Design a protein around this ligand. Structure first.
Ligand SMILES: O=C(Nc1ccc(Oc2ccc(Cl)cn2)c(Cl)c1)c1ccccn1
Lengths: 134, 130, 65
């Protein structure tokens, strides 16, 4: 509502002394503060879920799936704690946009892979390969 | 004076002016002074005009994009396999003990992560940022 | 098995984070400072992760229990 999305052609912002080297860059707003603001709520959910996992270690094993949850949360927190310095360190660079895009996509793929694998793959393996104990 | 050279006249003698080539980001339309091309475009080779600065983006065939796209395809295939496996064996005790509904929500989240990798790679044409 | 897996995972994350911060920099006067600090902190972090995940629990049990 506040501001509809629009594209920006940075015809400048990379002006060099050689007129041949001049290049415009096609982008769409999406400044760094926007990325941080859009990811903040999910990161807060992450942190509180990890807090509850820390607070719930130790179970009569009737409540299974707590132990895999702990590993998933620790792994994901490590991923994003590593992500932050890369975003704040390549801010002034000649190829900032490529690195930031690749970093964000790789981080999200890694998080999804960790959750999917470590919470579902044993079950699939048992279901197909060992139907006797399903 | 040749094209791209600027004329300056010695006082007292209308003849034998001086020529001057101006600078990189200037073009000479007056034949006595050279103007400046705006930020959008760039001085022409002849030094009396302007040419548009090329625009660059992120392209699908670059090394910056081949790796995330590969990972996204592999992950999407794996998640689809898992979802279908759960769908076929919906009544089995393991799936019933997995917490079915929230498991489906989590699977949707994983699928969305791979899809957003695709979106971020794709292109800047307004609706994509939406 | 679990400590070794955790150690590998954390070290791999550290070095994959090191590569873009190190090889892409503002190409300015403070480039040597940034590169040196990044390298040294990464190496120390890897060493500390190995020491913590392989030896600290055993020492804790030996001394305090
Ligand atoms: O994105 C990550 N890691 C990464 C690794 C290599 C990369 O490749 C390049 C290529 C050239 C230059 Cl100058 C710089 N980096 C790039 Cl962009 C990124 C990452 C690593 C750990 C956790 C989360 N995310």
């Amino acid at each position: 509502v506040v501001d509809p999305p629009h594209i920006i052609i940075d015809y400048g912002e990379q002006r060099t002394l050689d007129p041949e080297k001049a290049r415009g860059v096609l982008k769409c707003d999406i400044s760094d503060l926007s990325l941080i603001c859009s990811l903040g709520y999910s990161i807060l959910l992450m942190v509180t879920c990890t807090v509850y996992a820390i607070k719930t270690r130790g179970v009569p094993e009737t409540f299974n799936e707590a132990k895999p949850i702990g590993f998933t949360m620790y792994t994901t927190c490590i991923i994003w704690l590593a992500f932050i310095p890369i975003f704040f360190g390549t801010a002034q660079s000649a190829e900032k946009m490529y690195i930031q895009t690749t970093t964000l996509t790789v981080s999200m793929s890694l998080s999804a892979s960790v959750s999917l694998g470590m919470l579902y793959m044993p079950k699939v393996y048992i279901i197909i390969f060992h139907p006797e104990q399903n | 004076c040749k094209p791209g050279e600027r004329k300056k006249t010695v006082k007292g003698v209308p003849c034998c002016w001086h020529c001057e080539r101006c600078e990189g980001y200037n073009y000479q339309v007056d034949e006595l002074s050279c103007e400046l091309c705006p930020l959008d475009q760039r001085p022409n080779m002849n030094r009396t005009g302007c040419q548009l600065i090329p625009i660059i983006k992120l392209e699908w065939h670059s090394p910056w994009a081949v790796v995330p796209v590969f990972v996204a395809i592999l992950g999407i295939i794996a998640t689809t396999f898992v979802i279908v496996t759960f769908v076929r064996y919906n009544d089995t005790p393991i799936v019933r003990a997995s917490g079915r509904e929230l498991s489906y929500v989590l699977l949707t989240g994983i699928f969305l992560c791979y899809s957003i990798t695709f979106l971020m790679i794709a292109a800047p044409d307004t609706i994509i940022c939406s």
